Design a protein around this ligand. Sequence first.
Ligand SMILES: COC(=O)[C@H]1[C@@H](OC(=O)c2ccccc2)C[C@@H]2CC[C@H]1N2C
Lengths: 218, 220
Amino acid sequence: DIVMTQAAPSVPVTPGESVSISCRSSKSLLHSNGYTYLHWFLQRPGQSPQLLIYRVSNLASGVPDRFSGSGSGTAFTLRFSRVEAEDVGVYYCMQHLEYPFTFGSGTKLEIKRADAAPTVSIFPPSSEQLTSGGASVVCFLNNFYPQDITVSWKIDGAERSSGVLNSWTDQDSSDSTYSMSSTLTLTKDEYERHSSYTCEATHKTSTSPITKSFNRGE
Amino acid sequence: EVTLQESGGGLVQPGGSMKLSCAASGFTFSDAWVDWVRQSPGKGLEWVAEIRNKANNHATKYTESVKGRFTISRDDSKSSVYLQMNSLRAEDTGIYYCTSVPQLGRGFAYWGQGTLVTVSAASTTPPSVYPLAPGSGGAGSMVTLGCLVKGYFPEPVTVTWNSGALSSGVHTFPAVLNGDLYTLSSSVTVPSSTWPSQTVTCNVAHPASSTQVDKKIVPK
Ligand SMILES: COC(=O)[C@H]1[C@@H](OC(=O)c2ccccc2)C[C@@H]2CC[C@H]1N2C
């Protein structure tokens, strides 16, 4: 099979500036008929892929003028004249010359913006869940930047690593921030063996961790 | 408006069978070649199969891993393409998309919304929906509320707030699989002047189990 390679797993860019993404094929994509069968696709978070450029440099219907493509044989480039925050997503190249048709691994465009401290909210188990014998403590760490953050759970001061479920949103297409959800899953019995539950978040925006907590006995 | 709509996806038993359908509209389906492309982690986008138009003898081509197990077909009278999948394996799990190469080319110009195929022997289980309300009084500030959707299978579940009226400050997180069951959370942030004066409800739907739950977030 023809192997499509997209070296960069991601590429950081600031809104307003130009950027380019590369793709390489293991075999020339030039067909006997003179055409080069290489296409570019965009896949926004939670959406299906969509055609951006076909046959190296032809912009598809509805694709913004800021996109352009170049290349030949085995080296191709996708270019943005002015990147916008809404451009977040994964960009893939695909060869449409031989079967099996194959795709590159994709390059995620990451938007650079100003640092933003997370808005941290902690939630005690709901009364409904408790009646059901469960006790999940939820912590939301919303709209922060950069993307990396560390979350630690403390029960009566002691750290807890097991029973923690974490999930992260893709970069926001409007404000370019990231959000995270962390859930400490305990049984009602366990929950009642302690009183202080803390969601401790460490982010580059502060030397001291952002602490949110509550007491069960309250 | 060109449109491709998949259906027939969902949970399927390993070794079982499932037939995906794709209805086309908005373009000349009979002149197009139609393809199925799937997506899974640690594989990204993967071409699956293609059926050519009548002029090109309705020829079919399949990727190596599904040859002999999958069968692609089309019914031009219904502008639909199908993917009959047999002896399904774990590796077949993922989002399946219908895409076409219209009469004048342009690679895969049109794509459907995708249908999730989950190959698993686990049973369909409805979610439990819990309201997440602040543990203290707010504040002219912003307040964050949430919804915990736990213990369901398979994906997906849809979460809205106030039937869709609240979407701007919403963050619905990717589901996380625990002991054979998914747990997902969604947060919504609104002015302290909005809640609790106005009702803020989480509407959860789990198509697989036909579950629908409305949970009102009430101050604790
Ligand atoms: C227009 O696209 C093509 O040329 C494709 C293909 O043709 C079609 O997909 C097609 C679609 C509609 C009408 C006619 C041909 C023939 C070969 C195999 C992939 C590619 N080409 C190299």
